[PDB]
Design a protein around this ligand. Structure first.
Ligand SMILES: Nc1ncnc2c1ncn2[C@@H]1O[C@@H]2COP(=O)(O)OP(=O)(O)OC[C@H]3O[C@@H](O[C@H]2[C@H]1O)[C@H](O)[C@@H]3O
Ligand SMILES: Nc1ncnc2c1ncn2[C@@H]1O[C@@H]2COP(=O)(O)OP(=O)(O)OC[C@H]3O[C@@H](O[C@H]2[C@H]1O)[C@H](O)[C@@H]3O
Lengths: 124, 123
């Protein structure tokens, strides 16, 4: 099936699906976020598509798109705003630290690929 | 408006928040724009992500995505990469933190379910 088996199991607001097939590196590069709610005519209230950068930078015929760290930075900024507001919680605090530490580890991979001169190539 | 990202060098795209703070003091619209340009100076990538503005059971709330959806996408991407030929230790640490972050977001959802406040503009 195309639907992602998410960690949240109950009272999910939206459904996330993979679109297409596996591409470079064995990963899908197109995802759909659709709401579980419908309008008055039975169509999705939300139906958004996220297109990832398919093909590394230096490899030819690559297609420009969003990168994974961009999505985490949005989530990082959202959690920081909620923690600064009136509806803060310890759950937000732990999730924020993990998002930032995940963002750091993705930066570590970026810098490591700059040291080995492999950034933007189909290498390990 | 531009987000200060942890990655400082060789950034593919630039993220910026659109509009003003909304419910809970957070922004509900972001734009991902690539640093690359075409021959005339146009941004190659320019996607828009609008969040659920207002709790789902409150009136006038606008339907949108939420943060756990974005992490689940990144979670599935890292799982596929780790199962592919380009696995790395950095992805393994990033995937664990992303998943653990998702479990804390679900911990918040389950807490609001027990306290019967999920989908309401409360604390
Ligand atoms: N956590 C990862 N993030 C991205 N890519 C990863 C990861 N883990 C393994 N890979 C593989 O290495 C290749 C180049 O890596 P890279 O240095 O990051 O290139 P890039 O300029 O950043 O673009 C990225 C695009 O590259 C294509 O192949 C990628 C992946 O298959 C993909 O379609 C990417 O979407
Ligand atoms: N990590 C958080 N994620 C979401 N919301 C958070 C967080 N931390 C604090 N809040 C605040 O509690 C309210 C209800 O939360 P909730 O139980 O999750 O309702 P919801 O159906 O999931 O929609 C969510 C929308 O609610 C509106 O107010 C929210 C937030 O201000 C916002 O616009 C939301 O975008």
């Amino acid at each position: 099936m195309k639907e992602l088996s998410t960690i949240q199991k109950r009272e999910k607001l939206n459904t996330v699906e993979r679109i297409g097939s596996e591409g470079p590196g064995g990963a899908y590069h197109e995802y759909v976020i659709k709401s579980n709610s419908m309008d008055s005519q039975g169509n999705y209230d939300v139906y958004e598509t996220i297109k990832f950068q398919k093909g590394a930078r230096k490899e030819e015929k690559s297609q420009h798109g969003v990168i994974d760290s961009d999505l985490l930075e949005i989530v990082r900024d959202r959690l920081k705003s909620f923690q600064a507001g009136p509806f803060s919680s310890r759950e937000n605090a732990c999730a924020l630290t993990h998002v930032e530490e995940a963002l750091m580890w993705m930066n570590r991979r970026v810098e490591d690929r700059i040291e080995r001169n492999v950034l933007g190539t189909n290498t390990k």
